[PDB]
Amino acid sequence: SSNYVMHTNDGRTIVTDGKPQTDNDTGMISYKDAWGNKQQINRSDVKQLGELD
Template sequence: MMNKWAVAISAVGLVFTVSGCSSDYVMATKDGRMILTDGKPQVDNDTGMISYEDQKGNKLQINRNEVSQIIKR
């Protein structure tokens, strides 16, 4: 329970810390990573994949089951 609170507090802190960046969304993964995206990530309900563009302009995908939350900045 305490670990979930720590992750949530860290996610909120990261959002405020990177507010100067050009990303519009932050995706928190279940393994603790924070992924900054340019634009809104798109969910494909047929495949279960989330497509997004990273800060370098690369188009990437991640399985929806790996993402714990998506936060709009």
């Protein structure tokens, strides 16, 4: 498991704990934030996704 960075279309930068995934129930992009909380965002709002080094 490796951390990722998501750049959103509204100019935010989100660091994820592990690789984000399409949620099986909602079709949204599911991720765990740096505080361990599970969040979901719309794929259409994600501009770029890359593994953090």
